[PDB]
Each structure stands twice: as structure tokens, then as C-alpha cells.
Amino acid sequence: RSGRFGGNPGGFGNQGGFGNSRGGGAGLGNNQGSNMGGGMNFGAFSINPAMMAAAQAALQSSWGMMGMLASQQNQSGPSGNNQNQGNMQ
Amino acid sequence: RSGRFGGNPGGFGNQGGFGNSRGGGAGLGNNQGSNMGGGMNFGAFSINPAMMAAAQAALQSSWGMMGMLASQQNQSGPSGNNQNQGNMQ
Amino acid sequence: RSGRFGGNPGGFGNQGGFGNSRGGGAGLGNNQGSNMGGGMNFGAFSINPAMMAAAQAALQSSWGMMGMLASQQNQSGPSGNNQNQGNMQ
Amino acid sequence: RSGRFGGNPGGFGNQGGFGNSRGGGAGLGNNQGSNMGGGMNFGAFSINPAMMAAAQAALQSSWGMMGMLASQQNQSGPSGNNQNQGNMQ
Amino acid sequence: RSGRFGGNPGGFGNQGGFGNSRGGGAGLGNNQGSNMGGGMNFGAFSINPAMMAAAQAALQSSWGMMGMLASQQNQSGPSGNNQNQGNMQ
């Protein structure tokens, strides 16, 4: 057994004011042989976020436990494309 | 047994003010041999979010437990395309 | 047994003010050999969201437990297309 | 047994103000060998959302437990198409 | 058994003021043979965040326990593309 994470509860008491936090958890954990990105925005529990992303990319991944024996992965990336995106006003 | 996550409950007490948090969880966890992205926006529990994404990409992934034996994955990416997207006003 | 997630209940007490949170959960978890993206917007429980996405892409994935033995996946991506999308006013 | 998710109930107490939340859940979970995207908008429980998506894409996926033995998947993507979409005013 | 993380609960007591924290957790942990990036923004539990990312990239990863025997990974990156993204006002 492996890859455990504990809880982050809020606890006992009142809360007031501006931009405070108690307990909570955020991030990227326990992923196996996976790809995340190549042009991606992620936003949660937030006030007025603004985000811009632009990517020309190639990603390749692999995980094996008594696996990937006498095998092959082959990838050729994007070639010769044209793309235009307008304004947000 | 593996890959456990604890709960993040809010707890006991009142809450007032501006932009506070107690307990909660957000992110990307326990994915196996998967792809996420290549032009994607994600927004939840938020006020006035604004997001722009543009991608030219290739993604390839694999997971095996007594698997992927004497096998092959082959990928050729996008080639020679044209794309135009207008304005948001 | 594996891949467990705890609950994030709200708890006991009153709530007022502007943009506060207690308990809750959001994201991408426990996916196996799947693809998510290539031009996608996702929005939930939000006020005035604005989102633009544009993609030229190829995605390929695989998961095997005593599987994918002496097998093959082959993919050739998009080639030679034209696309125009107008304005939103 | 695997792939469990806990409940996110609202709890006990009053609620007033602007843009607050208690309990709740949103996202993408426990999918096996599936495809999601290639030009898709998703919106739920929201006020005045605006979304634009444009895609030229290919997606391919597979899941096997004592499966996918001596087998094949073959895909050739879109080629030589023309498409125009007008304005929303 | 390995790769354990303890909980960061909030504890017992009241909380007021401006920008304080008690307990909590944030980051990237326990990933195996995976890729994260190539044009990506991530924001959670925040007030007025602003983020810009631009990438021309290639990423390649691998994990094996009695795996990756007599095998190969081959990657050729993006070549000859053009991309323009507009303003956010």
C-alpha cells in the first residue's frame, strides 16, 4: 500500500476579515504515465481571474510494472500549420 | 490498496467578510495512462473569469501491469491545416 | 481496493458576505486510458464566465492489465483542411 | 472494489449575500477508455456564460482487462474539407 | 509501503484580520513517469490573479519496475508552424 494523503479540514472557530484561509488542499498528485498541458487554463474558487496560454508542443509518457517488454512508441509532431485567434474586448 | 485521499470538510463556526475559505479541494489526481489538454479551459465556483487558449499539439500515453508486451503505438501529427477564429465583443 | 476520495461537506454555521466558500470539490480524478480536450470549454456554478478555445491536435491513449498483448494502435492526424468562425457581438 | 467518491451536502445554517457556496461537486471522474472533446461547450448552474470553440482534431482510446489480445485499431483523420460559420449578433 | 503525506488541519481557535493562514497544503507530489507543462496556467483559492504563458517545447518521460526491457521511445518535435494570438482588454 502506498500514495496516501491526509485530510485538511477547517477546524473549530469563527472566521471574518479579508482573504483568510484555514485547512484546504490544491495541486497535482499521484498521476502515473499521463500528460497534462499543451495549452490549458485551470481556475477554481477564485475572484476575477484572467489567463492567456499559447503552445506549439509534443508530449510522450509511459509507466510499466512487468510491462513495456519488447515494445515501441513512435511520435512525429505537428508540421506546416497556420492559426489566428482574435481579441477579447 | 493505494491512492487514497482524505476529506476536507468545512467544520464548525460562522463565516462572514470578503474572499475567505475553510476546507475544500481542487486539482488533478490519480489519473493512469490518460491525456488532458491540447486547447482546454476549466472554470468552477468563480466570479467573472476570463480565459483564452490556442494550441498546435500532439499527445501520446500508456500504462501497463503485465501489459503492453510485444506491441506498438504509432502517431503522425497534424499537417498543412488553416484556421481563423473571430472576436468576442 | 484503491482510488478513494473523501467527502467535502459544508458543516455547521451561518454564511454571509461576498465570494466566500466552505467545503466543496472540483477537478479531474481517477480516469483510465481516456482523452479530454482538443477544443473544449467547461464552466459550472459561476457568474459571467467568458471563454475562447482553438485547437489543431492529435491525442492517443491506452490502459492494460493483462491486456494489449501482441497488438497495435495506428493514427494519422488531420491534413489539408480550411475553417472560418465569425464574431460574437 | 474501487473508485469511490464521498457526498458533498450543504449542511446546517442560513445563507445570504453575493456569490457564496457551501458543499457541491463539479468535474470529470472515473471514465474508462472514452473520448471527450473535439469541439464542445458545457455550462451548468451559471449566470450569463459566453463560450466559443473551434477544432480540427483526431482522438483514439482503449481499455482492456484480459482484453485487446492480438487485435488492431486503425484511424485516418479528416482531409480536404471546407467550412464557414457566420456571426451571432 | 511508501510515499505518505500527513494532514494539515486548521486547528482550534478564532481567525480575523487580513491575509492570514493556518494549516493547508499546496504543490506537486508523488508523480511517476508523467509530464506537466508546455503552456499551462493553474490558479486556486485566489483574489484577482493575472497570468501569461508562451511555449515552444518537447517533453519525454518513463518509469519501469521490471519494465522497459529491450524497448524504444522515439520523438520528433514541432517543425515549421505559424501562430498569432490577439489582445485581452
Author numbering:
A (entry chain C), B (entry chain B), C (entry chain U), D (entry chain A), E (entry chain D): 272 to 360
Q: Which of the paper's sentences describe this entry?
A:
TAR DNA-binding protein 43 (TDP-43) is a ubiquitously expressed RNA-binding protein with diverse roles in RNA processing. The carboxy-terminal part comprises an intrinsically disordered low-complexity domain (LCD), which contains regions enriched in glycine, hydrophobic residues, and glutamine and asparagine (Q/N). The abnormal assembly of TAR DNA-binding protein 43 (TDP-43) in neuronal and glial cells characterizes nearly all cases of amyotrophic lateral sclerosis (ALS) and around half of cases of frontotemporal lobar degeneration (FTLD). Here we report the cryo-electron microscopy structures of assembled TDP-43 from the brains of three individuals with the most common type of FTLD-TDP, type A. TDP-43 formed amyloid filaments with a new fold that was the same across individuals, indicating that this fold may characterize type A FTLD-TDP.
The fold consists of five connected layers formed by R272–Q360 in the LCD. The first two layers are formed by the glycine-rich region (G274–G310), the hydrophobic region (M311–S342) contributes the third and fourth layers, and the Q/N-rich region (Q343–Q360) forms the fifth layer. The fold is centred around a kinked, 11-residue β-strand formed by A321–Q331 in the fourth layer, which forms steric zippers with β-strands in the neighbouring third and fifth layers and imparts an arrangement that resembles a three-bar chevron badge. The third, R293, is located in an unusual buried position inside a compact loop linking the first and second layers. The side chain of R293 is completely buried in the main conformation of the chevron fold, and its positive charge is only partially compensated by hydrogen bonds to the surrounding peptide groups. We proposed the hypothesis that the burial of this residue may have been facilitated by the post-translational modification citrullination (deimination), in which the charged guanidinium group of arginine is hydrolysed, yielding a neutral ureido group.
